[PDB]
Amino acid sequence: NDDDNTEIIKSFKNFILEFRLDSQFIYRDQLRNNILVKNYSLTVNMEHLIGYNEDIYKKLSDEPSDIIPLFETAITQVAKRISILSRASLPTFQLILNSNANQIPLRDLDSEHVSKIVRLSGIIISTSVLSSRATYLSIMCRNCRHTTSITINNFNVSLPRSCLSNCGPDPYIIIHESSKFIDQQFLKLQEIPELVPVGEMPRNLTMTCDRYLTNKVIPGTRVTIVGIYSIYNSKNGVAIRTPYIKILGIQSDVEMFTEEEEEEFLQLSRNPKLYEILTNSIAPSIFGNEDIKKAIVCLLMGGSKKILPDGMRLRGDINVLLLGTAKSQLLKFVEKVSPIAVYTSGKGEFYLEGGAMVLADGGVVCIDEFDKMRDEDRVAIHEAMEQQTTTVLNSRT
Amino acid sequence: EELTLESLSNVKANSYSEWITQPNVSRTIARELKSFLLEYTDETGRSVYGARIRTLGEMNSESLEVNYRHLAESKAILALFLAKCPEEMLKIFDLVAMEATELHYPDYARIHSEIHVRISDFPTIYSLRELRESNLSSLVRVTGVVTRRTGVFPQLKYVKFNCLKCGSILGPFFQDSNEEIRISFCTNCKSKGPFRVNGEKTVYRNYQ
Amino acid sequence: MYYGISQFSEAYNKILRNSSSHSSCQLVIFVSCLNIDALCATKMLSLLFKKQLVQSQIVPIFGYSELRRHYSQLDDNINSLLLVGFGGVIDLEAFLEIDPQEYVIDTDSGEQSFRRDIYVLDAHRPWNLDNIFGSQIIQCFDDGTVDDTLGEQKEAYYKLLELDRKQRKKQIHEYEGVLEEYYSQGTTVVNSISAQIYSLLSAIGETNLSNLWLNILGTTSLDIAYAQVYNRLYPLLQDEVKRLTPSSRNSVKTPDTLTLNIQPDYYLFLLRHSSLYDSFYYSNYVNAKLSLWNENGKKRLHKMFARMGIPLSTAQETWLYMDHSIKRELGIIFDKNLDRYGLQDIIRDGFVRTLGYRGSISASEFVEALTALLEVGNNSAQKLTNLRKRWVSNFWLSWDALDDRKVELLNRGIQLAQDLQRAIFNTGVAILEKKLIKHLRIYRLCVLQDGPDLDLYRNPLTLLRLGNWLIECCAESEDKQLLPMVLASIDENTDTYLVAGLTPRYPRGLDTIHTKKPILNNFSMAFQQITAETDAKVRIDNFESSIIEIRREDLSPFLEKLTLSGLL
Ligand SMILES: [Zn+2]
Ligand SMILES: [Zn+2]
């Protein structure tokens, strides 16, 4: 057996060290660079692997859970060979995949896809916090004091019960100090709103990522994911097991000024009627209201906030009042063009913070009708704007 | 030796199922079921079940529609037997479906390794309150409004296991969908022990 | 006759002797765009000259009038003109109004010479006898058709030219009738221009795998329309493939390893680059056989896939991602039940290029992608000029695509082909449901006025694709006799119908006593006669005379004359 695993490892090593297009060992160079930036991880295109030899790709598809670790081991060996002179250490490398094949709608996923490399997409609803996963362990035997260790993978083990040089039922124990661990996040994904069937709740599903795939996205972000449809025996129905997905790879659907930008702004300044051009440009659909356009420009531009040596600060955020839907469209346009804005006409795991207005900072905060807005009474806005303010409102908008 | 359908009429068994589980009895039941499927036809003479199989393959549906009256029309003995002991004859008729589908669609197992028989027009009907222990262990046609639905989670259709003591592999027992396996014994070493599930060999069915 | 096959090398040597000078380029190659085989031929010639290091210029052209104006702007320095896939039937000397005396130089002595040389590779068939015989400045690389079929035509032409009275009538009328009989016959491409150029290279010994691949592509493109020509040429291309095939067999696949091997090229659409289900769903032959256009055809398609025992889900998966078992046993799968469904004709062995690990491609798929790129690569007179400029840009885009390095462009062309094919299929099914096809008893007229896809159909090749699909479905429909097919497409910007006259065709697989006969296309002659008789504005400028334009209001009167025409 182990011979066949070694053969697969050798095949993957050959793929990495040999797969060449035109005149570039794309994967060799990519690995070398990723090492050069200490990013011990490789990304592989499925199509490329198939092109090199269909057999390896098919074997991977058959038993991803075991094939993948072998491929990562091959990556590690290649990295050692290309980055450290032989006869003259590196961590296990993360392997990243990109099938780019036909997707499977979240709802469609079922028993058929179990243990199969799945390819799909959605919008991430939430992101957990990273946790420890023990890649390597340091293990002491409780009574005979026999040293040992375990190298665990994040696929498909438990502390051995036997002495291995009666000593006890589980004489082994963990030495956290010598042991080594990695990061592991947990993400939850909902089907695309469009993908949701007629008048049906959007389905949701949970994942886990680790190594460099950690912290690659944030909640409320459309994304396409590749992973193995996986099932785990949740402690929380007879023979019912909780289904999840192991994230093989991620692609972002949605995914500072350079010389050109500053040049353009300088030229804009060169224009004498630049201010007039602006005023003409704000909400062109809202004809007239010239003073309104001027005030919009001023508010968008804010002011020279100054802090005196004594400490007392000079506010720079201007606040403008307007008095049907014409103003609604105006504020909508303002928020659209505003670098940051908060539009709301007054309608507005153990943690509580301030109201919506509190979260607003910088940018702008718009309200269609104060005469309609009375939530939290005016005094909250009074303070939040006059003073720009445990319960302190450290905002400036 | 196999038995005649009239011979099947003589249950001559401790229980209806006891009669069905009889090997030659099972052979006779399967033969009669296949005969019905291929032969029973609408008044038009077209094999309604033939067209049903055609569509089943075409749509790749894994469930075969079946009308109870049709069997009541012909081979009604089997209708009564199924009513008494639905599970056994359901299994047998599902295998009959295997055979009926494959002949018209050879190698359909690729598309669906299995099929599911869907009886329809079951004459007897009871309300939830009408239900009685007498009704238990038998098919019942009932109506209502679904109150709450759970998400479709996978369930272990077939399960092997691994005795912690030795437990290289344990039989791929079929999970009943209502209780756990609890073999509480090991063939490799005759005793109890932690029988770790064999992830290598296991079939998963959608559950809800 | 003028330049027979045997003397292609001699003509090429003459071209060198005339225009070979590193000092300046005296060779100009006029090429009629919107023709795959023409593009392949031009690329082959370009490579040849690159080997010979003779500076030259490439001139894409779309219409006869464009060719006329381009010749008007020509410079005397140029002495060699290469016309690719255009001008064979027209009297170029007359059309370009070339006076022999204007160009005559160094005539001497029983000899003649001129300052310029017009070489024609337009292998349609109805060769302009004046070009063949009357003209000398005109040079036509004939495939021997003249010396094998037009010998009586040559005799009649030379007799009529000789005539310069009962006997006079008794001879002149017969010769005129002979010439007219050689005329009044519809056009039908005789042979691949790419094939002729490949033969010339063989004469020059320049043959290499790349040239053979180009010739294969040109012939494969020609196949769809003139399947008989492709059948005739296929053995020769296979022979050349074996001839250039390397000795090494089953050599370990390496990035540098490049092969051009013959193996089953199933008559489907983008099989390697589209799901089996999709390939079947858009294979013109498949839809024609199963009438997939109707929903019952889709039902039968599902039934057929079930018969295959292939999970439909799998059939819709990306071809590159098929399971190895199916990806390899598909041969047996097709061997079984294809006849049961009557689709056995789909099985076809064909050339399939491949390179390194990047993947493989069938000549059919490659030419399909090339056509897609040619079509969607990107004041009324200005609008037409801009449209033809887009077409020329697509021509050059395809030229670039020919290079292997630009695999990205080929992939883009593949996606464009998929999109265009699906759009064509949707339009065709809508048409058939609409029953827009009208049995006029002289043709099955089907005029198009619906908005969607009309913009695309302004391209002659797009209209040709739609009409080809329609003709496939009709010919497979035994009820329909081989009536001439007429297609028109109004352009709102120009308010003109893109009239296209599409010849019928016997079922692809059909190869009985009939089908052997070539159904010539009289659409062009009928259109020209009606246009001369009438005055409805039209555009015969397009090199493919079968395709012409007409005002939105000039259409129906022109159609009325067309059904009135007895020429069809
Ligand atoms: Zn110990
Ligand atoms: Zn045991």
Amino acid, res. C438: K
Task: Name the residue among B41, B58, B163 with its Cα closest to residue B105.
Answer: B58
Any idea what the CATH number is for the domain that residue B99 is in?
A: 3.30.1640.10
- Residue C182 located in a structural domain: yes
Which string of b and e fits C529-552 if b means at least 16 CB within 10 Å?
Answer: bbbeeeebebbbbbbbbbbbbbbe
Which of C324, C330, C418 to probe by mutation at the A interface, max A CB count within 10 Å?
Answer: C324
DSSP result, A223-249:
EEEEEEEEEE-----TTB-EEEEEEEE
Find the ligand nearest to A160 CA.
1
Which of A158, A231, A236, A244 to probe by mutation at the B interface, max B CB count within 10 Å?
Answer: A231
Going by C-beta distance under 8 Å and a sequence separation of 6 or more, which residues neighbour residue B84?
Answer: B16, B17, B138
Assess whether C366 and C503 both reside in one domain: yes
Which chain A residues are Cβ-neighbours of C405 within 8 angstroms?
22
- Residue C80 located in a structural domain: yes
Assess whether B33 and B110 both reside in one domain: yes
Contact A54 C327 (CB under 8 A): yes
DSSP result, C60-80:
EE-BHHHHHHHHHT--TT--E
Instruction: Give residue ranges of A with CB < 8 Å to any C CB.
Output: 19-22, 46-48, 50-55, 58, 61, 99, 101-102
Contact A101 C255 (CB under 8 A): no
What resolution in angstroms, rounded to 1 decimal? 4.1
Q: Which residue of B has its CA nearest to C304?
A: B58
- Residue C355 located in a structural domain: no
Going by C-beta distance under 8 Å and a sequence separation of 6 or more, which residues neighbour residue C419?
Answer: C376
Q: Which residue of A has its CA nearest to B159?
A: A239
Separation CA A306–CA C63 (nearest Å): 72
For B123, counting Cβ atoms within 10 Å of its Cβ (0-12 exposed, 13-18 middle, 19+ buried), the class is exposed
Contact B152 A231 (CB under 8 A): no
- Residue C255 located in a structural domain: no
Q: Which residue of C has its CA nearest to B109?
A: C309
Assess whether B27 and B120 both reside in one domain: yes
Assess whether B161 and B117 both reside in one domain: no
Q: Which domain holds residue C427?
A: 362-568
- C328 to chain A, any CB pair closer than 8 A? The answer is no
Please give the distance of CA C328 from its chain centroid, rounded to a whole number.
33
Separation CA A147–CA A164 (nearest Å): 10
Separation CA B11–CA B17 (nearest Å): 9
As given in the structure block, the two tokens for residue A270 are 């060169």
Domain count, chain C: 3
As given in the structure block, the two tokens for residue A288 are 């007239």
- Residue C348 located in a structural domain: no
Assess whether C389 and C336 both reside in one domain: no
Contact C320 A50 (CB under 8 A): yes
- B175 to chain A, any CB pair closer than 8 A? The answer is yes
Assess whether C211 and C290 both reside in one domain: no
Find the ligand nearest to B166 CA.
2
Instruction: Give residue ranges of A with CB < 8 Å to any B CB.
Output: 110-111, 114, 156, 203, 231, 237-243
Interface A-B, measured as beta-carbon pairs within 8 A, has a size of: 44
- Residue C179 located in a structural domain: yes
User: Of the candidates C246, C263, C290, which is a domain's last residue?
Assistant: C246
As given in the structure block, the two tokens for residue C496 are 């003109």
Identify the three-state secondary structure at position C408: helix
Find the ligand nearest to A163 CA.
1
Residue pair B144/B128 in contact (Cβ under 8 Å)? The answer is yes
Residue A325 annotated in ligand binding: yes
- C253 to chain A, any CB pair closer than 8 A? The answer is yes
Assess whether C278 and C170 both reside in one domain: no
- Residue C262 located in a structural domain: no
Instruction: Give residue ranges of C with CB < 8 Å to any B CB.
Output: 299, 302-303, 306-307, 309-313
Contact C324 A54 (CB under 8 A): yes
Q: Which residue of C has its CA nearest to A21?
A: C255
For A331, other C-beta atoms within 10 Å of its C-beta total 21
As given in the structure block, the two tokens for residue A377 are 């009474």
SS3 per-residue string spanning chain B: CCCCHHHHHCCCCCCHHHHHHCHHHHHHHHHHHHHHHHHCCCCCCCCHHHHHHHHHHHHCCCEEECCHHHHHHCCHHHHHHHHHCHHHHHHHHHHHHHHHHHHHCCCHHHCCCCCEEECCCCCCECCCCCCCCCCCCCCCECCCCCCCCCCCEEEEEEEEEEECCCCCCEEEEECCCCCCCCCCCECCCCECCCEEEEEEEEEEEEEC
Report CA torsion sign: C459, C460, C465, C469: positive
- B154 to chain A, any CB pair closer than 8 A? The answer is yes
* Chain position carrying tokens 């197992």: B109
Q: Which domain holds residue B90?
A: 23-124
Assess whether B31 and B120 both reside in one domain: yes
Assess whether C515 and C437 both reside in one domain: yes
Q: What are phi and psi of A251, to 5 degrees?
A: -135, 135
Residue pair A248/A226 in contact (Cβ under 8 Å)? The answer is yes
Assess whether C441 and C478 both reside in one domain: yes
Paired sense of beta strands C485-491 and C496-502, if any: antiparallel
Residue A348 annotated in ligand binding: no
Q: Which residue of B has its CA nearest to C311?
A: B111
Of C299, C306, C313, the CB nearest to B105: C306
Residue pair A102/A119 in contact (Cβ under 8 Å)? The answer is yes
List of chains touching C (3+ CB pairs within 8 A): A, B
Assess whether C159 and C95 both reside in one domain: yes
- Residue C267 located in a structural domain: no
Assess whether C532 and C386 both reside in one domain: yes
* Chain position carrying tokens 């339009």: C427
Assess whether C368 and C292 both reside in one domain: no
Please give the distance of CA B141 from its chain centroid, rounded to a whole number.
17
Residue A328 annotated in ligand binding: yes
Assess whether B84 and B172 both reside in one domain: no
